[PDB]
Design a protein around this ligand. Structure first.
Ligand SMILES: CN1c2c(O)nc(N)nc2NC[C@@H]1CNc1ccc(C(=O)N[C@@H](CCC(=O)O)C(=O)O)cc1
Ligand SMILES: CN1c2c(O)nc(N)nc2NC[C@@H]1CNc1ccc(C(=O)N[C@@H](CCC(=O)O)C(=O)O)cc1
Ligand SMILES: CN1c2c(O)nc(N)nc2NC[C@@H]1CNc1ccc(C(=O)N[C@@H](CCC(=O)O)C(=O)O)cc1
Ligand SMILES: Cc1ncc(COP(=O)(O)O)c(CNCC(=O)O)c1O
Ligand SMILES: Cc1ncc(COP(=O)(O)O)c(CNCC(=O)O)c1O
Lengths: 412, 411
């Protein structure tokens, strides 16, 4: 509180954001609320250490204890996911994927990855991203009728295009991904397989989604989604030769000094995820998501892509409400429900309007919501979107949000 | 209490805290951030996805994160006079990655400082993305003076016709003539990029010529002499480049920014706008010059170029019959933390090297003045000359203890 007097404007903004998280329903599928330990590690004196290199082999003196922290994160990662090798230095999921491609393919090589509209990430071959700029991406999508991955189409594309690498994983796909089937297709055309499990990494760790690590040549992930850790990336592999290429790619390939205080937060979160309570959290995530999907399915005007969820998220086509994703987002904001607009498969509008919204349950599950409460959130979402600027209706939605946020204090 | 759930992690963090307390941190690129910076990094801002830029995000709920990031952008602009600022780079390497994307094309010819002479890895080392992605030509320093020969730089630029000239250094103790670099770049039709990561605090305090008026793009880290959290930043005065910089950072090479880190950047920039920061920055250079004088007079330690104009020095340890890695290990055993470092025309591998690098930002932050800097330098000399006399080493340890007890850090 002493330093808060020196910079009133900044600490005032941080206080508002704390209230915002307290008083809104955070439904961004890729968000979560980290523990106090995760925040304490990020707020620690480890921010002061330069530690270029890897544990035991640094380019600086004085890394005795940073080496303990980083090996803590590596070892717990290997235990969480069954990988023989782990790199915990990527600053983000985008840095992780950048180094993974460096260890797997050459510039210009052909890569088969999920199309962004269908659910793939920017770094799975978007042409405004390094991935699409550096490599020759062929995109697979979802079936127009079922809106799930057609693995025959993936195989057809793989045979047609003879990719060096197939990428699986998604930012906006609510369904189980068949990594074994992907491995089988990659083997038929002689390609490598990279799996980006960033969104489902927590569910994988809890055994509630098939684990890609045994199948993928390289597995990448973020630490800050369903894994409920600090923001950052990680790279997993079982091949010792790839592990050497990954480590060289991360540093001195594309990064310099690692963020050791963030890596401390990773070690914190990995140990939390190894706790048996974490598995109960993860099942609650899926139970809550399925509960909301059921509410959204019964409502006309919220159309759940593929009609179901197997994991933490849902993609909602809002077009039949006469709105686009950007306006659906702002409507829900005006009643203190935070989502993001999101492209849906076969998206026809720009990535800034879109035809839908995305909703995920990890953050409300973390603050304590159960299925009854998830159901109330979805009902509130449907009500707000059907309101059509009936301000009385909207204020009732605000009331229900207020009841939910008071029933489940977060930072209080 | 949450510390009881993970005793191994929290013990390691506590040991690192004592280590910073009881060792002399002489690593030129390190510092000790304020309680406010750590509090900002340890805040709830880590929970926010904020892809995009203030006002134009891909997520809901960014009203207050937008305030924070604009605080950091605006303070960066007031500190350095840049018309545009990008505060989202996760690191200095990410900053430079986006800068190159905004300036040149893969395979283009870039003229950057050789690593041994003092340049950074991202200034064209062939094990780095820079050397792999672009055709780098290196300029170095004169062998006799160990400072930059700007006529040799002009000859190289004329000969190789680079699309881009990069100036800036990780281990160069002397003033860089950014005006001269701009002039050379203009003669051969090149763009100019300046990576001021090490001197950014000195630049902010007006103690090193400011590159922002000269460089097409200026990159920096926020965590060296700027005494901020770990991260990068990209500055420019050109509206077209600013747009290319922003697209290069996101969605070019990053995803969501680290908003708690950007909060810490905003904290640190306001600290640097305070007049005490200028006195801190002046003390940095005074302490560095004080140590250089000790090293010059000591037999066995040779200061590269024989002088410093900024925060750091390269010490050629070869006359002591050791290499930089051994010098690093000796000094660590007496609680002095340095890093081995290549010297100009380095003949050994980057993991052995012929020297060590020493900088004063961190001991200056603990409060050291020139008298105390002189004692640090004398202790470094005593330890490197100790040569298996364990009694001498114990005396060095005692002197380190007197200094760290006199200038408490985390206590
Ligand atoms: C993380 N990300 C994401 C993703 O990567 N993949 C899916 N399926 N869904 C999502 N949802 C949320 C988020 C969306 N991020 C995006 C998505 C698309 C773009 C994009 O194409 N932008 C272009 C054009 C933007 C425009 O026309 O407005 C650019 O030049 O920046 C830029 C950022
Ligand atoms: C940040 N960095 C640095 C730098 O970039 N530039 C200078 N002048 N001085 C320094 N000092 C500290 C630090 C040193 N970092 C380095 C320096 C050199 C290398 C390098 O050449 N590595 C090679 C192999 C080196 C070897 O033979 O051991 C590699 O394949 O990884 C890798 C990292
Ligand atoms: C000291 N010295 C030096 C050195 O001895 N060794 C190295 N590696 N590097 C350097 N760098 C700086 C300095 C030498 N610099 C130069 C650079 C260029 C020239 C040069 O081309 N002079 C020609 C004239 C060339 C012309 O005008 O056509 C000559 O005949 O003197 C002569 C000397
Ligand atoms: C599958 C996947 N991979 C990589 C990333 C990139 O991580 P960083 O933002 O840390 O670079 C994301 C981000 N997904 C964000 C979202 O879905 O909202 C992702 O979903
Ligand atoms: C001039 C310069 N530019 C970029 C970087 C890279 O920043 P990151 O480590 O955050 O990627 C460094 C690191 N210099 C580290 C040192 O001198 O010890 C640097 O000195």
């Amino acid at each position: 509180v002493d330093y808060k007097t020196f910079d009133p404007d900044l600490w005032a903004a941080i206080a508002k954001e704390e209230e915002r998280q307290e008083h809104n329903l955070e439904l961004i599928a890729s968000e979560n609320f980290v523990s106090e330990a995760v925040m304490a590690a990020q707020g620690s004196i480890l921010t002061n250490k330069y530690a270029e290199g890897y544990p035991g082999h640094r380019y600086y003196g004085g890394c005795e204890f940073v080496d303990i922290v980083e090996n803590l994160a590596i070892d717990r990662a290997k235990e969480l996911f069954g990988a023989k090798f782990a790199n915990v230095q990527p600053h983000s999921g985008s840095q992780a994927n950048t180094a993974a491609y460096l260890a797997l393919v050459e510039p210009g090589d052909t890569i088969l990855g999920m199309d962004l509209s269908a659910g793939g990430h920017l770094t799975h071959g978007s042409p405004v991203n390094f991935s699409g700029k550096t490599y020759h991406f062929v995109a697979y999508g979802v079936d127009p009728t079922t809106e799930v991955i057609d693995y025959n189409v993936v195989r057809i594309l793989a045979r047609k295009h003879q990719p060096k690498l197939i990428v699986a994983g998604a930012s906006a796909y609510g369904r189980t991904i068949d990594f074994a089937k992907f491995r089988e297709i990659a083997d038929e055309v002689g390609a490598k397989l990279m799996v980006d499990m960033a969104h489902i990494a927590g569910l994988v760790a809890a055994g509630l989604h098939p684990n890609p690590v045994p199948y993928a040549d390289i597995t990448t992930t973020t630490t800050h989604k369903t894994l409920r850790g600090p923001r950052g990336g990680m790279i997993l592999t079982n091949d010792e030769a790839l592990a050497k290429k990954i480590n060289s790619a991360v540093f001195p390939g594309i990064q310099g000094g690692p963020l050791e205080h963030v890596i401390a937060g990773k070690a914190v979160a990995f140990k939390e995820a190894l706790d048996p309570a974490f598995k109960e959290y993860s099942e609650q995530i899926i139970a809550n998501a399925k509960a909301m999907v059921k509410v959204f399915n019964q409502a006309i005007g919220t159309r759940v892509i593929s009609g179901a969820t197997d994991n933490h998220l849902m993609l909602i086509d809002v077009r039949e409400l006469g709105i686009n994703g950007k306006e659906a987002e702002s409507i829900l904001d005006s009643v203190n429900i935070t989502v993001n607009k999101n492209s849906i498969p076969f998206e026809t509008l720009s990535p800034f309007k879109t035809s839908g919204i995305r909703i995920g349950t990890p953050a409300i599950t973390t603050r304590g919501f159960k299925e009854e409460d998830a159901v109330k959130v979805a009902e509130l979402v449907v009500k707000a979107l059907q309101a059509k600027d009936d301000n009385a209706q909207l204020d009732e939605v605000k009331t229900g949000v207020r009841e939910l946020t008071e029933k489940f204090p977060l930072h209080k």
